[PDB]
Design a protein around this ligand. Structure first.
Ligand SMILES: NC(=O)c1ccc[n+]([C@@H]2O[C@H](COP(=O)([O-])OP(=O)(O)OC[C@H]3O[C@@H](n4cnc5c(N)ncnc54)[C@H](OP(=O)(O)O)[C@@H]3O)[C@@H](O)[C@H]2O)c1
Ligand SMILES: Nc1nc(N)c(OCCCOc2ccccc2CCC(=O)O)c(C2CCCCC2)n1
Ligand code: NA
Length: 163
């Protein structure tokens, strides 16, 4: 089955300036816990956004979606479409689409689960910000309690499944 996983500010921002515009260690831990041992599918800009020690994401099968036919991505599998990414030669019990905004929009109709971290950080969207998908009435969810990060931000985790 196919899930999306993302972290967003309350305003809906997921990315800015080729990175993530807040620091939330508990979300990094949540992301690793859900994805370790499994397949992670990402757009090429997200692959390029990964910090050095996380490119590729260790312990996960990294799959990068690009239109660049000749692209080499050391440590990842390069495919030419989201459908290809979700049609592996070797099946995985759990495939996670891990961003970014362009790929989330393509994957949402193919997914049955979304794992969302909401971050209470004031970020009025800027024009080039990458934004989260919005889940419509075909999705229903459950919300964890609001927690405080050791680094100061309030955050909570939501779990949605297709109705
Ligand atoms: N949870 C989070 O907070 C989270 C998670 C992930 C990323 N981010 C952030 O999000 C931003 C990146 O997101 P983004 O939306 O700009 O980019 P993205 O979705 O990661 O990557 C876009 C790229 O995917 C490829 N692509 C898109 N549609 C395609 C299609 N139909 N077929 C083949 N390839 C296709 C293209 O690669 P080519 O140009 O190579 O052809 C395109 O440039 C960064 O700021 C990153 O830090 C945040
Ligand atoms: N909930 C949720 N969903 C996502 N798709 C997601 O982006 C995952 C793609 C970006 O990876 C980053 C970014 C920067 C630093 C480290 C990593 C990976 C760490 C690892 O796993 O080796 C995230 C990240 C948000 C920023 C902090 C790390 C996790 N969080
Ligand atoms: Na690895």
């Amino acid at each position: 089955s196919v899930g999306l996983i993302w972290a967003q500010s309350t305003s809906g921002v997921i990315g800015r300036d080729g990175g993530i515009p807040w620091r939330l260690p508990e979300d990094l831990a949540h992301f690793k816990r859900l994805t370790m041992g499994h397949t992670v599918v990402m757009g090429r800009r997200t692959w390029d956004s990964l910090p050095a020690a996380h490119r590729p994401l260790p312990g996960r099968r990294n799959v990068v979606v690009t239109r660049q036919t000749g692209l080499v991505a050391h440590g990842a599998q390069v495919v030419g479409s989201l459908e290809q990414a979700l049609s592996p030669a070797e099946p995985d019990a759990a495939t996670w689409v891990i961003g970014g905004a362009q790929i989330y929009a393509l994957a949402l109709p193919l997914a049955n689960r979304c794992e969302v971290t909401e971050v209470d950080v004031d970020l009025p969207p800027e024009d080039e910000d990458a934004l989260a998908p919005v889940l419509d009435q075909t999705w229903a969810g459950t919300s964890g309690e609001w927690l405080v990060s050791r680094s100061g931000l309030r955050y909570r985790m939501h779990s949605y499944r297709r109705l």
